[PDB]
Amino acid sequence: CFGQCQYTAEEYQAIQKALRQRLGYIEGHRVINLANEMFGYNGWAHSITQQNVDFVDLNNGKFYVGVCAFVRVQLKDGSYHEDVGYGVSEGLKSKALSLEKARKEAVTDGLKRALRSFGNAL
Amino acid sequence: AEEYQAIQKALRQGHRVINLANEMFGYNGWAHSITQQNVDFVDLNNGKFYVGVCAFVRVQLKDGSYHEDVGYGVSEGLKSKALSLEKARKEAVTDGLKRALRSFGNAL
Amino acid sequence: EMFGYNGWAHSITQQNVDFVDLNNGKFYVGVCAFVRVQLKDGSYHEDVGYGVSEGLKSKALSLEKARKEAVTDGLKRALRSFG
Amino acid sequence: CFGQCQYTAEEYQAIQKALRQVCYIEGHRVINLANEMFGYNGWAHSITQQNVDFVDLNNGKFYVGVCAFVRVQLKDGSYHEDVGYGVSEGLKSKALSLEKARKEAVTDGLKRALRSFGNAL
Amino acid sequence: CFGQCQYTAEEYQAIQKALRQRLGHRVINLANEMFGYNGWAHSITQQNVDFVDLNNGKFYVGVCAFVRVQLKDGSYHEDVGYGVSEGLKSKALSLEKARKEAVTDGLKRALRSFGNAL
Amino acid sequence: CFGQCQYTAEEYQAIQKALRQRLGPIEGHRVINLANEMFGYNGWAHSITQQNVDFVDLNNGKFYVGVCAFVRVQLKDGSYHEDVGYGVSEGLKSKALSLEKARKEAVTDGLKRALRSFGNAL
Amino acid sequence: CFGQCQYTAEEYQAIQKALRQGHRVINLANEMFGYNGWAHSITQQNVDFVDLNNGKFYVGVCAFVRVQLKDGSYHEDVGYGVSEGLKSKALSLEKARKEAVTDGLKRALRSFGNAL
Amino acid sequence: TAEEYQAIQKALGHRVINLANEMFGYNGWAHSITQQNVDFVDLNNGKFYVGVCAFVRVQLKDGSYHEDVGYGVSEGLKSKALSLEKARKEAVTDGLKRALRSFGNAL
Amino acid sequence: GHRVINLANEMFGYNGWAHSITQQNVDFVDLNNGKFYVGVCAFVRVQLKDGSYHEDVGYGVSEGLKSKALSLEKARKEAVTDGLKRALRSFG
Amino acid sequence: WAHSITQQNVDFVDLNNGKFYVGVCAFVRVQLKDGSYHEDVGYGVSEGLKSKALSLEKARKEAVTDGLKRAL
């Protein structure tokens, strides 16, 4: 099953050389496509380990919100990483909208930052 | 086995997304669940309801490959608790399940 | 319903009462139940059951029937995924 | 799976031989260095706990300070841990101060936890 | 697998002889040289800010950390490092110094329990 | 694996005879050295099960500190021992130094006392 | 491993026969069981009370000094210890707890037979 | 194994301990203090006064176990700690006596 | 004497049955005239080698007694013994 | 069969004129050898008793019986 398989030497080396094709910045969907092509559709998973809210203030009618969320990224073999995402949704004037924005931006930023460690190609 | 190449290349290309997933991954080959849910807040200021909820969803395939994402639902202006919590705690699940399947490929 | 309660099974993962109100003079109750449907082929899903009773006489009367309705609705809606 | 397979003699010799070869270590270079030295399938990395110390608000600034614990691990079974400490100052919006502190802490922890496997890192 | 392995007799005696010699970065380097990078591990089981006093502007900090050291055989060791701090006019820096010195001293002390060569 | 394996008969008799003898010539370092030589660097472990600060006070510009500790030795065979060490400090001007001394002497005293249970040699 | 080995019949009978007959108790237990025949641990310890009459402290501590044996049989027993006259609180608690542990170790060990 | 049970069935201060040792063997029975509660303390006229309870427990080789609740008091003493010491020790001994009594006519 | 104890011992065997105490709480004691009353509950328990078990409840009483020790000890013993009698009756 | 008392609470203790009145409610449980189980909370009161001791003795039995007759 996922997280318990092993790769072949030649494909392992091909992937290893692929991941170092370094550029030398947010492209949310494009990172999903890149991962799908470099590890396959059936290659990677990511869970939201935790999600806490730091502050929901109403200073001047305008809201201010802060959400921090830890995300985890795993590859078919069983290796894993983890990083601290963080989304901010200041400015809005409908608590539901600020919560939408922060809670959906923190996860994406975390998935971006947790995927730059498997290689420099991402 | 050969179907692996077919699915991988095909992925490279509303409620209809559920049937789309059933056709693409097989109508017996995709599952989901709700790992957690939290009524975020309820408030009234002018005799009306603003109910929001955050709901996490999970999706896994036949071989165990999985993903997750945050779902969210909102409803404003409704008179009673019944309808507002008929709407938000009802649509957050679908919104999350829509935003989770997009991660598996462009075709979704 | 081709197979019925033999090709698929159900169970409430968790339930919690949302709100109970009496400002109107009668019991206003809202309940939620999470049901999961599992198939013998390994496919499974889950949906948020939900039921409500408005302005009934007693807490138990407004709560038990609302719970039954919520479970029935959750079962009814959880079966969409096999369409 | 990860953390269970054991090296072969030549691999162990190579890695050991490699690892032996006031300003900080520039930060992000360590991820590339470690990835090339152990491999992408080589190691893992996790945050076992993260906790927030004072968030004071003197004279309108914000001084968030966070602490972190970073577990590194090689596929052979070894592991390590260390304590990192983000900081902040001057930022006028708690969103930015929290962001800076929380993000800096984990990188610092990863650096100080990789430094324990040798001098080269 | 780490913890489930047992040293080989010849290497076991070799290490026995090694650790009986007569002599922060130095300690870690020496531990790596003897046991090897694969050889051992290091964990932090608990921590606690003992006191965070504020006398006259300075920030007197104190952190107690229990560091565990372990070897692929299964041997444990634990000790109590205490990282003092003093004189700093900014709270964050004082807490940083204390929390780092704590684990450093803990590792030092917990390693001495193995042999005199440390 | 340590803690799940028994001693070998010849080593058993050697250890038995060695422990029964008596010191010829206690300070902490020598106990550590003798224990190491007696079992090696691989024959045991020591850990702190609990450590509560019994009291900390002040009387005219100083700190009478005191701490407790529950050390615990163990041997490859599974036998174990425990004992309550106890530390003290007087006249120190700074709280940090007093807590330092107390916490540090506690564990070493506990180690000496817990080891002593095995034989007269120590 | 400790807590799972069965006693060899000859050793069982020998220890039983020798059973029908503090530093002293520690040594005797070590010789009768061997250096790896038993273990001892502190299950709980709660300062029963403290006090101060005229600058001299009073202390009291309880200890449930579990003492175990290779075959798996075990005993526990309430200990106790006390101090008086001592002018320093830390010294008082040190003496009290140190004596309580050994008193419990005695009373527990003085149970497997008249030998102890 | 059944022979030991049959022999015990046919058969059924320090004397209770000695009888238990002779009856079950040095490894035949354990005893542990499940809980201890101090029910009062008094300072009437300089003489302390205390009683304690303890849910002593016993076990045999095959796992069959019992339990009970003893009690001991202390009067006429001058030092509190001495009072509690005697109370706890006597309570444990008396509870053990009652637990052993529970097992049969032999005890 | 508590003949029920001996009867159970002879019927099931000394290892055939068991005993336990699950919780005990003094409902009250009062200083009515210096002859304190005492009656204390006790969640007794009993089992058997076959697995079938029966919890129960008991409540002894300490009639007027000038001695606290006698009252408390008598209550604590009587509660357990009466509960044991009750549970044994259920076993049959 | 087996039964247990997993919670219990005396509701009312009362006295009119040297004659006590009391109320209790106990949380009984049951089980069966086949793995199935039954459960029913009960209730019990004692009225017009000479001593509080008798009332407190009686109420627990009445509550336990009320729960058990239903659950069993």
Residue numbers in the entry:
A (entry chain C): 25 to 48, 65 to 162
B (entry chain B): 33 to 45, 68 to 162
C (entry chain A): 77 to 159
D (entry chain D): 25 to 45, 63 to 162
E (entry chain E): 25 to 47, 68 to 162
F (entry chain F): 25 to 49, 66 to 162
G (entry chain G): 25 to 45, 68 to 162
H (entry chain H): 32 to 43, 68 to 162
Reported in the publication:
When visualized using cryo-EM, we found that the two species of full-length RAD52 represent open (RAD52-OR, peak 1) and closed (RAD52-CR, peak 2) ring forms. The 11-subunit closed rings exhibit features similar to the RAD52 NTD, whereas the RAD52 open rings have one or more subunits missing. The structures of RAD52-CR (2.9 Å) and RAD52-OR (3.2 Å) were determined using cryo-EM. The RAD52-OR structures contained a maximum of ten subunits, although open rings with fewer subunits were also observed. The structure of each subunit in the open ring was similar to that of the closed ring. As expected, the cryo-EM density around the site of ring opening was not as well resolved as other parts of the structure. Consistent with this, in addition to the ten-subunit open ring, our analysis of two-dimensional (2D) averages and three-dimensional (3D) classes indicated the presence of RAD52-OR structures with fewer subunits. The RAD52 open rings exhibited a high affinity (KD = 0.3 ± 0.1 nM) for 40-nucleotide-long ssDNA but not double-stranded DNA (dsDNA), as measured by fluorescence anisotropy. The RAD52-ORs annealed ssDNA in reactions stimulated by RPA, whereas the RAD52-CRs exhibited a reduced ability to promote annealing that was unaffected by the presence or absence of RPA. Importantly, RAD52 adopts open- and closed-ring configurations, such that the open rings represent the active form of the protein for SSA.
